[PDB]
Amino acid sequence: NGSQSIKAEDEKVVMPYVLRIFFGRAQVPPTSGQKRSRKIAVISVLPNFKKPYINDFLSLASERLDYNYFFGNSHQINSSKATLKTIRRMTGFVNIVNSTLSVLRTNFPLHTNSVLQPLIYSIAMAYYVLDTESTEEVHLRKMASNLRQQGLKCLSSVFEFVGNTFDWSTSMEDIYAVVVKPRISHFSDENLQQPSSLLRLFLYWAHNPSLYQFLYYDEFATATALMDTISNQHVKEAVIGPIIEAADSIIRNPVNDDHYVDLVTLICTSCLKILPSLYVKLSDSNSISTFLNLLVSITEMGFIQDDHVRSRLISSLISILKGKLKKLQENDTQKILKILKLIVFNYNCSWSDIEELYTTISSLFKTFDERNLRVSLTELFIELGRKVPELESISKLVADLNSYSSSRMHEYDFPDFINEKPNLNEASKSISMLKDILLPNIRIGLRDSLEEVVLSYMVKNTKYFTDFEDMAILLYNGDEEADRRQRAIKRLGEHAHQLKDNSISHYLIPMIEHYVFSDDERYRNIGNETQIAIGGLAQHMSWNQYKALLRRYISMLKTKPNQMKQAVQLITLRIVRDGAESKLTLSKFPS
Amino acid sequence: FEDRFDAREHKDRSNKSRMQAMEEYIRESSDQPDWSASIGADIVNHGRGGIKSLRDTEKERRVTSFEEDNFTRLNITNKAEKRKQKQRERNARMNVIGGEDFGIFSSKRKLEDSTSRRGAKKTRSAWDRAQRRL
Amino acid sequence: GISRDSRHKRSATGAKRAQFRKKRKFELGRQPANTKIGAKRIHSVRTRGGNKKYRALRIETGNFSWASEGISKKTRIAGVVYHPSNNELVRTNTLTKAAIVQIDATPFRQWFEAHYGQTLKIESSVESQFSAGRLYACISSRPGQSGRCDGYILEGEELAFYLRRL
Amino acid sequence: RLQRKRHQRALKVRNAQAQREAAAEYAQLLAKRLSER
Amino acid sequence: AAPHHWLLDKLSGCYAPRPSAGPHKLRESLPLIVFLRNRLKYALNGREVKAILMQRHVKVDGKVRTDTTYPAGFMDVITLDATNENFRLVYDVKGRFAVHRITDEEASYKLGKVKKVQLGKKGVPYVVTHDGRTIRYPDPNIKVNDTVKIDLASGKITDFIKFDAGKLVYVTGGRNLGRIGTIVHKERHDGGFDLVHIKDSLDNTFVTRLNNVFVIGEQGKPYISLPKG
Amino acid sequence: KGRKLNYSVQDPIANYEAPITSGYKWSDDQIDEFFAG
Amino acid sequence: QSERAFQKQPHIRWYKNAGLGFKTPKTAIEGSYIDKKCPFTGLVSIRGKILTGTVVSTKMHRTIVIRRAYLHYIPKYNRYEKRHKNVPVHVSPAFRVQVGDIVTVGQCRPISKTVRFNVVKVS
RNA sequence: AUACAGUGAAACUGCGAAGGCUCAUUAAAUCAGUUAUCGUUUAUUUGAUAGUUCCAUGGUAUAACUGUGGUAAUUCUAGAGCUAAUACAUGCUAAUCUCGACCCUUUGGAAGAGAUGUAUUUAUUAGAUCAAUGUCUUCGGACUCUUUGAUGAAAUAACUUUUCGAAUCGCAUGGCCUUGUGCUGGCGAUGGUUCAUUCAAAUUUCUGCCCUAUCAACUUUCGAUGGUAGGAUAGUGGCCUACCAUGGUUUCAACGGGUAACGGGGAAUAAGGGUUCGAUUCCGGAGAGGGAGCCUGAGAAACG
């Protein structure tokens, strides 16, 4: 008969709204008691009478789900629903602790709340009943103790009711009457917030606009309290950033920066949070990261600091200038952030950024020589913008070489901090050399020569565009250096980049031989570069299977010579992974 | 191609090559005795049959061993007895003279073809025959 | 039907002199029950133990599926206009699998007006049938084997995929 | 008749308390294997 | 009318006992009548082996299973209550069923080759063996042709033997049926003659199939005891 | 067009029926003066 | 790529893998070809054995006629008369096989009256 | 033993028969092994395997049986009267599962929110990451490209004339005091849905002893060869039909020619001297007067 009544519900829509409201009115007239319970509360209730009431709430749920647009709603059905919900609350909170009929009437009450939320799920902007405050005060006096009750990952009876009441136009009258956002913000600022906290945050972010478009001054102060909740909930959207739904945070922070500027410490906290929005997770997308940096700039245009947020915005621009993502949109937002950071370093940054980012002109090569002849003492964002131009951004090749040489000149004129800046230059040149670049690899080689300012002739002859006598002199220089972990790793990386699967050129056997000779000359340095030799042999072993295995086989055979010389010298090690790699070679032998 | 379980090649045959002249020479040069009966006990029907041949007393010993071993008398199964007992006793009185069967001397069956002249150790190399001697 | 065996016919080599055998039980070809529109009558035939098979002949209540949301709802049958597994099958107006048949789409109107409010994002050449009532939909289920008429609606790409044909 | 109504209901609730608990009692062993894997 | 595996003397009868259906196949098993009556000879005829089956002395795989033609296949531990008879029967080197005598702590378990692992219904991992013990929930690293160890009091897998290069394997099938020694070679082809190869006294070589071979332990330590000569 | 329109002669229908001499009760002159127009 | 009616489509663009040492080309993973009976996306599953040989004719579409000459140790007239075999095979979106072209095939699920093999490799 | 109580003609029941003769001549297509079926049926064997409840027990209609009879007559019959079910078919049925605001510290979970199947046939998708023994140590960390591992490349929207949530029995009075069968309460066989195995069958990969070119062409003349879709199927399948393409086999032996094909092929046992006698499965498929159509079953075009 459940399947039969489900068929009756699936065919219970064929009659008009008059007959649907008449059948709903007959369903309401079972145990309404509007003479007894339309004033305040009910007169009496029973277990089987609540079972008629639980069945009435279930029939209301089935009727609303069947006719989930119109539902034939009536104030008699509303009064019967309020009488049933109040009788469920009264019986559950007035019965003794025996829990059988109490859990029956509690699962009657949760299902009745689900059927009540179904009415607003079906007929939301259709009725908007003007006597809402009766049921609103009834449900408030029932669920006053539901302060932090709806704070969970699945608690969505009163949380969904609050979201429905907040996502309307004029049904927020019961919200702005006394309180909805107070208890919602209490459970939102609860510290054990699960991932419905983002749902409540998006609901309040969408519901601040109705409280702002409302002409009532009470709703204006409630919108002020929603901005105050956005300022007092400065840990929830931080700690709940476990998914890629950071567009809600970027949509609230832009709304907050466009709406309310209430404290300089609040603007500094917003700028530091949007700095953590780019220094917290690397999976933030382009529009979200651009709007987050623009919201940090919008808080900084109002109430920024002069030293602390100055350095924070300078670090933000020093990351965003190395990024420059999304076809110069992030570069334009980074130039705006550097012009809003309000320092002397930021002033030189905005000058040397606007003088180069003038919409694809020769002003980039003009401004590189301009700041070279007029070298600025900030130099951090200058080295960022001149190392993005030294990377695979095609123009400013000689200007990139002059920028690296001028950074070396400043690092020699310092004579400590600018040597740690040269450490960052070397840690950038390492990832530049281990890459598929053509102009930026030559620029990193020029930076290696400027850091080297026999060895200088070797570097300039490795970057000589000749490659036959040049590679012969490189092999002879490796022989002279044989007769350095990261340094020889960088040299062998540049050599492997110049001979990296370029099988349209000859002497690849001597090129791999020079790679293995530099690897042997690094592996002779056992006290330092044994780890680097192990890493280079490991990367060559990964390349021995990664889609190409002709010259990598000879690289494996000639990197075995370091092991042969080490075993002849030993005449303790790690035999285990060596034997397992021997088993892997035996498996590659059965290919 | 592929393997196929062959009981006819891991079954104990040992009878294609069992020749009575070779077996008699082995019994002569055996240097361990032969379990012969007390002399009257092996004649059969008061002399109406033969004595009994060596294969017949071997088969009789096997039948009595199986007999005592699983407690069952053998039977008078008609088709097998009308073949084997009558044909066996008629060739017994044909060829068994005084407890000795002379049927083989009247039978064409080459000794060296099947039972001598080893097939696995054929030694078809001068080096293999040299290593087989030394 | 007759058979399922290669013995009555020639292979990829061209052989003759067949004269093979009395045909067995397990070459059982039943009669082709061309399912039509009528009053719902399904023959419950037996095979392979208690393997009842529903052979539908006059089925109506097609469960056809709204595609973009996957809403299989109940409707009637009108007629198949194009099915060149037999071009006389559409002349005789039967109902087999993978046929494109017409449906009075009034419960789909009810579901759209029930879970969207207003009446009429969806394509225009099926919005014309949203207005008129008869929409094209293709049968998925097998009434000759499973006895049922299920199907999927035509929505856009598959619609024009058949409308350019016929 | 009514004693059979006692025994039927008792064997039914005992069958439930055996089977529906033992099923989760080896599903938790699957959970231990999945945590250790 | 007999197979080769039963070690059945020819002077027995005319009709050979077809085993009934059961765990193993017909071609890889011996029933209880050919086990008890005419191999280790606890009976003399079918009447008295049915008499002791009605008396229920047999306890194969820890359950009684009173039947004459019950197909005891590979290493089903036949247990007899009187004189505490524990019999694990394996293959010899020339194709027959060598029935080794074992003790109680060894007959408290058996092992079984896994055939397939399934996501059958309702998220339940799943394992079958040659007696078809559908036991719940092994680890995810059960490949085909590994070896579970059955509990034989309940049904649970207690230990697990992984199939890889360097494991002690038993071959039941084809022209290698019943050999032990498991190491000269490994060769996995792509559809046939794919195996791990088995030594001899002079460490000779052999070819078989994957499904016709299954692991019993390690190189020197199988926890099965084996007969000798 | 293989099995389509085999213009052959078939065995059991070659004498399945037999004709009739007078046939139509009308005359052929009655046909001509029946549908001259 | 749609010359017939009745919703020419994959049957649940779609992509799978039979495994067992046979690659799937990138157009056969994500391409506009339907792969109704090509086993990489397909509806068929792989099993059985894998045979290798050159071809004779690829005249009709979805018909790859392999040749397969193989050695057999003849003891009768003690000389090897040379083998020849034929098998029709459905297409794959990886190689337009012309004359020559030693390729291999895997056994699966009889497609026409005489084809159980579908191409998985070209070399 | 005044509602049953042992013998038991004739009736329902469970099963029995669980595999027997003759006739016309098929060249790996009859047969034997083998590969596979996530391409499929399965009684029995074996291992596993069920959560939707509004204002003390459900209905006549038939036997056997009596009684009246017909007919030459049957395991042929018809009226009239009763009467039972594991026959027919309507219908009676406690509250336990996770996340846990709070914890009073161990006797730890009270509030709130989310739960709950099968059988049939339809669609979207769950089905790239983090942990170090190390890159730099700045003896702190952004760590995966290197050195090794891991989750990982049935959840839901509907039909169906939907099956069920034990009217089976045995062993054990046993525990409790809800003040009386108030709760019985412990276990095992038979049930009972589904999966897998086993059995058997059907297809299917390949292999296997006559001479054959005076058989050099066959195949489209039961689709020839393949593709697409449907029908039918236990399912794969030109197995059948619509449409389309003109294919496919062959001198590396297609296709065709016959018998000591009452003989042969291991089809199998071999025998301690018979060297093609010498153990057997099968010659081919049919047939129950003759073709045709239908039915039954886990299995059939049934020796019944």
UniProtKB/Swiss-Prot annotation, chain C:
Localization in the cell: Cytoplasm
Transmembrane recorded as keyword: no
Annotated GO CC locations: 90S preribosome; cytosol; cytosolic small ribosomal subunit
Matches recorded under PROSITE patterns: RIBOSOMAL_S8E
Keyword Ribosomal protein in record: yes
Modified residues (Phosphothreonine): 61, 106
GO molecular function terms noted in the UniProt entry: structural constituent of ribosome
Coiled-coil residue spans: none
Annotated stretches, region: Disordered: 1-30
Residues recorded with modification Phosphoserine: 65, 68, 72, 85, 124-125, 128, 131
Keywords: Cytoplasm, Phosphoprotein, Ribonucleoprotein, Ribosomal protein
UniProt record, GO biological process: maturation of SSU-rRNA from tricistronic rRNA transcript (SSU-rRNA, 5.8S rRNA, LSU-rRNA); translation
One Pfam family per UniProt: Ribosomal_S8e
Signal peptide: none
Gene3D superfamilies, alphabetized: 3.10.290.70, Ribosomal protein S8e, subdomain
Annotated function: Component of the ribosome, a large ribonucleoprotein complex responsible for the synthesis of proteins in the cell. The small ribosomal subunit (SSU) binds messenger RNAs (mRNAs) and translates the encoded message by selecting cognate aminoacyl-transfer RNA (tRNA) molecules. The large subunit (LSU) contains the ribosomal catalytic site termed the peptidyl transferase center (PTC), which catalyzes the formation of peptide bonds, thereby polymerizing the amino acids delivered by tRNAs into a polypeptide chain.
Miscellaneous section: Present with 15900 molecules/cell in log phase SD medium. There are 2 genes for eS8 in yeast.
Family label: Belongs to the eukaryotic ribosomal protein eS8 family.
Protein name in UniProt: Small ribosomal subunit protein eS8A
Protein's gene: RPS8A
Swiss-Prot record, chain E:
Cellular compartment(s): Cytoplasm
Modified sites of kind Phosphoserine: 20
Pfam families with a match to the protein in the record: 40S_S4_C (PF16121), KOW (PF00467), Ribosomal_S4e (PF00900), RS4NT (PF08071), S4 (PF01479)
SMART domains named among the record's database cross-references: S4
Residue numbers of Phosphothreonine PTMs: 103
Domain S4 RNA-binding: 30-93
Disulfide bridge positions per record: none
One GO term of the biological process aspect: translation
A single GO cellular-component term on record: 90S preribosome
Keywords for the protein's UniProt record, in alphabetical order: Cytoplasm, Isopeptide bond, Phosphoprotein, Ribonucleoprotein, Ribosomal protein, RNA-binding, rRNA-binding, Ubl conjugation
A GO term for molecular function: RNA binding
Superkingdom, natural source: Eukaryota
Record keyword RNA-binding present: yes
Main function: Component of the ribosome, a large ribonucleoprotein complex responsible for the synthesis of proteins in the cell. The small ribosomal subunit (SSU) binds messenger RNAs (mRNAs) and translates the encoded message by selecting cognate aminoacyl-transfer RNA (tRNA) molecules. The large subunit (LSU) contains the ribosomal catalytic site termed the peptidyl transferase center (PTC), which catalyzes the formation of peptide bonds, thereby polymerizing the amino acids delivered by tRNAs into a polypeptide chain.
Extra remark: Present with 573 molecules/cell in log phase SD medium. There are 2 genes for eS4 in yeast.
Name of the featured protein: Small ribosomal subunit protein eS4A
Species of the source: Saccharomyces cerevisiae (strain ATCC 204508 / S288c) (Baker's yeast)
Gene: RPS4A
From Swiss-Prot, chain F:
Subcellular location: Nucleus, Nucleolus
Induction: Up-regulated during cold stress and following nutrient replenishment by dilution of cells fron exhausted to fresh minimal medium.
Superkingdom field: Eukaryota
Family per record: Belongs to the AATF family.
Misc. remarks from the entry: Present with 15400 molecules/cell in log phase SD medium.
Protein purpose: Involved in endoplasmic reticulum to Golgi transport. Involved in a protein-transport step blocked by brefeldin A, which disrupts the Golgi apparatus and its incoming protein flux. May also be involved for mass growth or cell proliferation.
Designated name of the protein: Protein BFR2
Underlying gene: BFR2
UniProtKB/Swiss-Prot annotation, chain G:
Note: There are 2 genes for uS17 in yeast.
Cited function: Component of the ribosome, a large ribonucleoprotein complex responsible for the synthesis of proteins in the cell. The small ribosomal subunit (SSU) binds messenger RNAs (mRNAs) and translates the encoded message by selecting cognate aminoacyl-transfer RNA (tRNA) molecules. The large subunit (LSU) contains the ribosomal catalytic site termed the peptidyl transferase center (PTC), which catalyzes the formation of peptide bonds, thereby polymerizing the amino acids delivered by tRNAs into a polypeptide chain.
Cross-link Glycyl lysine isopeptide (Lys-Gly) (interchain with G-Cter in ubiquitin), sequence positions: 8, 26, 36-37, 59, 76, 85, 113, 121
Homology family: Belongs to the universal ribosomal protein uS17 family.
Example GO biological process: translation
Entry-linked PROSITE patterns: RIBOSOMAL_S17
Organism of origin: Saccharomyces cerevisiae (strain ATCC 204508 / S288c) (Baker's yeast)
Subcellular location: Cytoplasm
Protein known as: Small ribosomal subunit protein uS17A
Lineage of the species this protein comes from: Eukaryota, Fungi, Dikarya, Ascomycota, Saccharomycotina
PTM remark: N-terminally acetylated by acetyltransferase NatA.
Gene of this entry: RPS11A
Coiled-coil region: none
